Amino acid sequence: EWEALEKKCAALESKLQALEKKLEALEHG
C-alpha cells in the first residue's frame, strides 16, 4: 500500500514536469 503510493507520487512528478515543458512550448508558439 505504502510502496504503491510512493510510486504514484513519483509518476505524478514526472508527468507534471513534462506538462510544464509542453506548456512552455505552447506559450512560445
In the complex, the residues that contact a copy of itself under the rule CB under 8 A are 1-2, 5-6, 8-9, 12-13, 15-16, 19-20, 22-23, 26-27
CB of 10 to Zn ion, least distance (A): 10
CB of 18 to a copy of itself, least distance (A): 8
CA dist list (Å): 25 to 5, 11, 12, 21:
30, 22, 20, 6
Residue 28 interacts, among a copy of itself, Zn ion, none and using kind-specific CB cut-offs from 5 to 8 Å, with Zn ion
What ranges in 1-29 are assigned the alpha helix state H?
2-27
